[PDB]
Amino acid sequence: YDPNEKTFDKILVANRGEIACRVIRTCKKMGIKTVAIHSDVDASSVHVKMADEAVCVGPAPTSKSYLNMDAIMEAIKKTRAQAVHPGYGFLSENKEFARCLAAEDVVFIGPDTHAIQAMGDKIESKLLAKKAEVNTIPGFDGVVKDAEEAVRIAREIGYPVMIKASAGGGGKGMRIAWDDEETRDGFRLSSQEAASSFGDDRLLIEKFIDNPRHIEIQVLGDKHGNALWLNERECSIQRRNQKVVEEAPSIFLDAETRRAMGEQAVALARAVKYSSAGTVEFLVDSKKNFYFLEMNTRLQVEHPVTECITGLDLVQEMIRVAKGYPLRHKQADIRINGWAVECRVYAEDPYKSFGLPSIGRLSQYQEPLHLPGVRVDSGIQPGSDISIYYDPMISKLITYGSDRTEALKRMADALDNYVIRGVTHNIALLREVIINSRFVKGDISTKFLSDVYPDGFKGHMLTKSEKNQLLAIASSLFVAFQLRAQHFQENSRMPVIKPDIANWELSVKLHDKVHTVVASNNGSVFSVEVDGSKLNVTSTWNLASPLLSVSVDGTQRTVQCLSREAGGNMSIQFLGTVYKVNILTRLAAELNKFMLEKVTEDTSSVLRSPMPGVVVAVSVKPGDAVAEGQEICVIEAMKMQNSMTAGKTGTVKSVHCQAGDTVGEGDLLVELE
Amino acid sequence: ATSVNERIENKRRTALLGGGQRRIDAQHKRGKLTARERISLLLDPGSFVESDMFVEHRCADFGMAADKNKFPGDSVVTGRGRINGRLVYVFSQDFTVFGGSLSGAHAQKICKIMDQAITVGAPVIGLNDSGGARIQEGVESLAGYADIFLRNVTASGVIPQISLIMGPCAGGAVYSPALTDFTFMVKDTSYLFITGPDVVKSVTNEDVTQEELGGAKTHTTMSGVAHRAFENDVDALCNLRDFFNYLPLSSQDPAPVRECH
Amino acid sequence: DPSDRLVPELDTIVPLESTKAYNMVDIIHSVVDEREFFEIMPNYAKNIIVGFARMNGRTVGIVGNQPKVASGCLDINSSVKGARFVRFCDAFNIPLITFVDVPGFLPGTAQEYGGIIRHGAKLLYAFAEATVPKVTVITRKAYGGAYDVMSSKHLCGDTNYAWPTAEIAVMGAKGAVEIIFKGHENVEAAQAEYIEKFANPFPAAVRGFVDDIIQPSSTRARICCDLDVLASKKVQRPWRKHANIPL
């Protein structure tokens, strides 16, 4: 961070959220004035108040605010900015924006137009890579135009077939059909899908690699003909073709394979004349054979995890290269230093399709910055909002250590000590994945989430000892609240006569089971008997702090109390998962068997929306009869479209959703018998 | 030679004439009197003592600094007098001076009258006909209403309070009569409502005019705000005199006793 | 639970544009101890919220407006709902905390025929009569006599604060322009200048009607200290058997 070297003086960040804050911090440390754009709903964002100056660019929708080239150009002209950093997403891989910026005067921090155009389509990329002597996926060049040609290709390429929609993509437009009938029907429906999405309708045929691993080599280049590969990354934990958990070094690769992959990536970068930061992605089979697949011509979302093991600052290198200075490192000087793990914290419900977007306003937000070896990249502060127009990503959590086990343990602790109140997040999934036996062993692949949970994510299955620990902690907390309720000030007119209860007998209801608990208090230590088992719980018993650290049988545990009500219901976050428990006194439990159950008039037959957003397409009309397994309507929200499934047979009495309507979460849509 | 004596006569003749002869003629054409003769008919002859007749407002916004917006007394006449030999304090608003809209000096005069009454222990009678709070003051009118409400609440249960609505009372001025013991109406000329019919047009979009919106019939038949209604002003004031002849001066005194047959 | 805990969640809860509504219950939960609140009549007259909470361990009563329902306008039901609670709290030496966001009273013919004046008088008297310590915070709006009804400085109030987003006037700008600048028949510049000069909490501050203009994040720490100072407040009133409720 030497400020003696001259660099730009005013940089405009044409993005929002975490990457905007990260770039602003990097420029602020390096001594460059900043400019931040925003929308009407982003007027109170973290990055807006973190940077000097601000320029509103339009309304809420992304089509008019962050994809509006004209507004960005007007803002750049007005603010007299000298350089622009697009970040990732939006106008970061759009060649028109780069062309316009290069045309007027402005320096665009990133690759030139030629590289973006070359690495833009899935056809020219493969030919260029093959010309660059880089291993590629077996297949047939040239867009398929008829089903007969597709199946003709299919015989020679092998029965497993991957048919892919050229251009667009970004996590959509892929299908794996192998049968000839499947081939033709997939061809037709993928053609119409491409027409609906982007309309080019060009399709390619290639061999489908089975049981793959996704390995990303980070490359860095300059304008003087130098290139470096900054080790590798292993990103195999995905749902909806998007990564959640990333690991800095690859436990599956040795030195020779790593060097081979790095040299091939550098050769490809030299072939395309790359002059910025980028990544090259490979698919690796079980036999340690790697095939080239895509090259991102921009900064990567999971970049910081490769900075921990290398010690470089990528955003600074990009800026220095954009100015024109050559690289100040050599390939021999890049080394692996420790181990690192990165997790992405989203605003989504992990119990529905491994994540379903949700909205809200944050009431409490605290990060575990005091824990050792923990780094947080967040664009969120208390009081922030989550809109239906942008990616629901909340934070990125990075941990580093001297080896895999230390990093994983620190990551688990940091996930335990992370406070979000106001929305629904996927911390339970992130914490339960990093303790899975297969993940710790190192045997993972792209479909890791699709076979560990065949029926879907249900939560953390707790064993007998952990169940006893949870019951003891809940009973101790309940008794602590009861004890705290009895402390009044002196009255001097009617003295308070404290009861002298020695043992508290409680009935604890969890899931569909009832346990008997006996609790005794001896100061700051609770002795708990759960069905014969004996445990001791000690803590400072601070009932106001969001985080509660206790010690059960010497083991240190961290729990959170999400909610509490006088009837006895409690919500406790424990080892990442939220458990709902009902605690009653034994006498009250005896008298609760005389209470009539409140009839609930909800047994299927309701198709209420599981997510908020805007419904655009409805496939049924009132008065029709539906069957099992077909979608009813599609709702688009937060860069995502979702269609609810079926499974019961009935007649649709009425439909409460039409095209273009706005629907909140849990609102009824389709009523049927 | 000093003109400090002709100034007194000019100020007095301006105060006795309100805001001009045209406004007095307009008031008479509507069937309404002015404040001073209501005071004269209400009290015993030769017993009225006026106070604070030389008090002026202090606004310096929207052009009131000119003399054309300069009126002595500030649309209120306050004093003390005797009814059948018993003491009482009286205040009335003048509709000729900015439509009786209350300002700092108006509220100050009412507050001084109420403070004297609560200090000595005499009832309070108010003759209300005002258009509400004058806008161009700003928050001082709100402060004046709040002070009047506070003194009304403080004196409740100590000395009796009576009110006659003799004209259109709208806005926040309708709450002082609601905080007193008794409320009376004059038919065909008195109104009481929170907002005018135009706001009803704007928000509810339903057909209604002022008479059934806030007339004496509405408040004496289906609203329960007013207590009685009177045919005209002279009969209303005579009935108020007769009614005041019934009740004591303070809660520390026993119920009045008269000669019987 | 420390009494000086900061609440940065409230720094942007109030939207800039006046047409949108927010939830006062969020502010109440953010301010009170342990975010615990016992609400009275939660499903009746939902345009006003009253309840019991604890501040630094001492029981307090909370009254506030709900801009989510009917834009915070007062009516017949909410007046009685607030008045009864305020009278009870005053009777048993329980301090009061008020959050003010009110545009005025609900207009219409049903409200007028129902006797809105009597119930407005109920609420006004209930606030004026109280002798317990009372603290008021103005969030967005305070228009007309309703601002007088909501325990202003002038009803023997103890401490009054206003957030930087607050604004106090007799009514909205359009009404003032149409009632003052009638002859000029040009409301283009008049409305702009009026909203620039008076649509802000400074006219009340310069006359001393509000004690301070405070940042929302320090609201709670401001209230607690006040409750430490006003706990020994005593006032004397003229003797009477009882007063005359507008019942």
Ligand SMILES: CCC(=O)SCCNC(=O)CCNC(=O)[C@H](O)C(C)(C)COP(=O)(O)OP(=O)(O)OC[C@H]1O[C@@H](n2cnc3c(N)ncnc32)[C@H](O)[C@@H]1OP(=O)(O)O
């Ligand atoms: C805090 C509580 C509030 O917000 S009160 C806001 C004021 N609300 C209103 O509806 C306006 C008040 N005026 C009225 O309602 C009507 O004029 C009432 C009282 C019904 C009288 O009926 P009408 O015969 O048509 O009026 P008018 O033509 O005789 O007007 C005579 C002069 O009186 C004036 N006046 C009246 N009220 C106010 C007021 N609150 N502030 C300042 N001035 C007021 C009018 O400006 C009018 O002026 P001018 O002498 O004709 O030039």
Ligand SMILES: Nc1ncnc2c1ncn2[C@@H]1O[C@H](COP(=O)(O)OP(=O)(O)NP(=O)(O)O)[C@@H](O)[C@H]1O
């Ligand atoms: N021959 C193949 N065999 C198996 N999986 C494949 C194959 N080709 C692509 N994939 C899958 O493609 C997924 C990654 O998406 P990718 O094709 O690289 O670009 P994208 O989905 O459009 N989004 P992005 O890479 O972020 O720009 C991997 O998880 C693979 O499972």
Ligand SMILES: *C(=O)CCCC[C@@H]1SC[C@@H]2NC(=O)N[C@@H]21
């Ligand atoms: C739109 O408003 C969301 C910002 C764009 C997100 C981009 S897209 C590709 C990268 N993958 C990911 O999850 N975020 C990045």
Ligand SMILES: [Mg+2]
């Ligand atoms: Mg990819």
